Design a protein around this nucleic acid. Sequence first.
RNA 1: AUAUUGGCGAGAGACCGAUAGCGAACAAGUACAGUGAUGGAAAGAUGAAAAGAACUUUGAAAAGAGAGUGAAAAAGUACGUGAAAUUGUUGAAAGGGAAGGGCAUUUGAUCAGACA
RNA 2: CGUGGAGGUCAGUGACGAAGCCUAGACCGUAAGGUCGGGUCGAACGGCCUCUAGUGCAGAUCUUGGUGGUAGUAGCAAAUAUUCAAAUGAGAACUUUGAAGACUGAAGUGGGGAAAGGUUCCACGUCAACAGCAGUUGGACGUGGGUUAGUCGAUCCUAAGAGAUGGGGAAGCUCCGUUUCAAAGGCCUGAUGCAGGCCACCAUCGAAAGGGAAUCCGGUUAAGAUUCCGGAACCUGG
RNA 3: AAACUUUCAACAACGGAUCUCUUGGUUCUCGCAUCGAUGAAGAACGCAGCGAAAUGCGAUACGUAAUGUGAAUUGCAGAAUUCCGUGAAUCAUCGAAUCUUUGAACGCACAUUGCGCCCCUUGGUAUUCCAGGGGGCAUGCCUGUUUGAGCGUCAUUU
Lengths: 52, 85, 49, 71, 17, 119, 50
Amino acid sequence: SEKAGHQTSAESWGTGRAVARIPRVGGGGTGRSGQGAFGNMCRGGRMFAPTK
Amino acid sequence: GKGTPSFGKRHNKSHTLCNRCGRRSFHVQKKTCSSCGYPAAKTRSYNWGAKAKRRHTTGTGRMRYLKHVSRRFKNGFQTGSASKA
Amino acid sequence: AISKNLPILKNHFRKHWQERVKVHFDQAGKKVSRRNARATRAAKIAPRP
Amino acid sequence: AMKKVEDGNILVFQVSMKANKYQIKKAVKELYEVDVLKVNTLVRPNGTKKAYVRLTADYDALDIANRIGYI
Amino acid sequence: HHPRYVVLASHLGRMMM
Amino acid sequence: AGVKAYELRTKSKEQLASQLVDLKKELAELKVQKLSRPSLPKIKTVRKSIACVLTVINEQQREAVRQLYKGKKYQPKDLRAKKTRALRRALTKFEASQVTEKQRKKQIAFPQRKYAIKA
Amino acid sequence: AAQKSFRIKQKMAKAKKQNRPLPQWIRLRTNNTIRYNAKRRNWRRTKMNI
RNA sequence: AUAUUGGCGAGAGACCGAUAGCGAACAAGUACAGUGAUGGAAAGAUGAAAAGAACUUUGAAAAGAGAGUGAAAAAGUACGUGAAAUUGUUGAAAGGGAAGGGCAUUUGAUCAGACA
RNA sequence: CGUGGAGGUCAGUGACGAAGCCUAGACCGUAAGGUCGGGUCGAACGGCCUCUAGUGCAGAUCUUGGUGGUAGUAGCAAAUAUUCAAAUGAGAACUUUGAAGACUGAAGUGGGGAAAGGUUCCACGUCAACAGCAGUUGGACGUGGGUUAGUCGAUCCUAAGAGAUGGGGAAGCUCCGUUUCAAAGGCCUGAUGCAGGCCACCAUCGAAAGGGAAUCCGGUUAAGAUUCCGGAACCUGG
RNA sequence: AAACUUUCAACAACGGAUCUCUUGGUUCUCGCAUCGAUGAAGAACGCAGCGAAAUGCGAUACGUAAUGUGAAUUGCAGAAUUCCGUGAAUCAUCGAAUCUUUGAACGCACAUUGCGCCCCUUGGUAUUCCAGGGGGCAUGCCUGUUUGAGCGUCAUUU
């Protein structure tokens, strides 16, 4: 599906927070909050070169 | 103090329940709902809010009357009663 | 960039072209539909051509 | 509630949320054939209206509760 | 769950110049 | 157990009213008895017997009104056809089949002929 | 607040009746999957936000 | 004749197989966070059948030790298999401010055999 | 060389035990790797000829999950303070009762309320988890009971303000405006029409601290009372 | 020499990888045209003998009537004539009904379970006051009906 792995509002936190620069989910009190988002290496992300 | 001592003064509602969507997004001073737009005749919905539409669209509730129209169509909107054959 | 001895190509794919691709997987299904609609029309106006 | 039937002549009922003291008074007269002195109503913390009813001096509230069949 | 935020910021002084 | 609809359809208006009150008195008794017992399933039968009597009463009163309005052009909106909104506003079979006096002449004179090209 | 609108008190009424453990006999039905009440609420752990 | 990532009813795949595939195979737009717009998870698998361990015994009790059901409790509602990190007991060995590795042999343990 | 899947064949393997896992046990290859023995387990897997790809990890302050050394370590040191006996219990520094010594010290550690919480209130049973020690106790866990009004509030009035109608803009979502360039309707006499006569604010929403009709004492519950019970009063409408 | 530290093995731990499963997802293809003032989509609160949810329903409340099948439902209790029959079943089908308070939402409002007017009818010795039961009162526009307005304007008396 062309939607898979891109239904998130994640933004990279930037350097200076002792964490990588991969985009991350916002908010609180969920458990998904602060995870990896779009990336191809990220759980629940998007696959490399989605099959067309 | 911007922090802990400031939060200790938070005891005034800015949003109460909405008579239509019932979601506690009804601004008391503006008399409008930041979710369903009440009292405007329409329901607030934007195309950048794809998720928002999925939460409220048709099918997410009971469909008291719309869940039978397909059955009635299959039979030609018949009127009467079974003839006890 | 321009690199070696090759023709000058022109591929017009700078818009959002992935939004308007039509692959005709239904070539076979359309043939059976055109063919059956031809057989049902014939049976309705028969014996006319 | 059972102390109130024995002591105060106060029949205690559950009534519909759409009712008012005038309708509660009418109902008891028709169904149970007793005159009511006054009706006091409150809404319970669970969403059901309760009604305390003090019958008049002539009708003994233990007799009526023993007729309906709960005392 | 545990929300998190920017730990300290500032209070690091300045260096060389 | 419980009342039967086909038996009620042969009773009169006054009779079915008397029956309705009788089952309401019986239901009140069951509820004061339920307060001293761990279970009392019979309450359901009496509760569904009140629904059968009411449905037959309304069915009688709707037929009478339906005979009173028999064959007059305006009748109550509740007794009409509950088709879809658009089906109710489309043209009647008579109106959509109308034709001008000119076109009718062309149809009679020059109909679509039936032919075959074998020989 | 002691002086409260009926609409708020009505929501409290629903909350009171939703505050109980799973009925035990539900655990015995054929092909049962429910283990506990996953929507339980307490006045100390979360707030209704009404 | 042409269009169709919505609704309805059907047939399929050189597709994914529970961190995959839709966010959601489960009481999933659920619990939960924010004043609000909004944000938004984890989570499948005893067995053919509960036959889900009667009874005896120690303990205040949870439990233990027996007895029993089952093809198997090395399947006990913490339940198919059950890896690694990390950990307890048992056995072998070495150990003067690290441990690990390469060539060669002595010592201890362990393995195969021509066989006729 | 190895992995998921696909077409052909081996009339391939298997509940007399397939795949997976563990094994300083064995063999083949320079290697990538292949093969066998044993133990565990329980239902499906491979050789060869070809086809295909979401096809091989030591790193990316990589993504998700799990686990260590630090380590029984740092630490549980503010608000003057505890002690003796019996009762209960498996168990008492921490519960109950009694005696003692102290503190808040009337701009209190007392007695009520407003916003806010929503049952935390009271009773019975009870201790797996919570009270960064303990627990027989608890604002915890299971099960129930409880909030009574002509007079206390809301309701009614208007304040800063918000907003319909008549209209004018704006492609449109809608903007202005609140008595404005409007044929803006309701009270009375008599006889549902008639003779008349008077009256132009202009809808409405906006305060549980502002305006405002009227209730006091005594008694009573596990938990309610200016609300219940007894007595004695007052206001509005008819 | 023990303790201690390290490597390996067996057993037991912590953890839930791997393997085998699968009422889900994803893509392709075929057919159809059906929401709403006759009150929709969505929301609030309720309904069972024993339910908090998902599902169903609306004071006729896990449902009523009708049609088909023809012996259940099940977790416990119950249901017994309901077993060669106008008849069990959270059964299938569905053409007759009910459908709380709302919502475009429509008597006026609504941080109020707030405040009115009209019609018929019953009780309080009652056209006027008070209560109960039923039925109604939004806005723009179209065709007609009735009642009107203006020296815009015609004829006609006098």
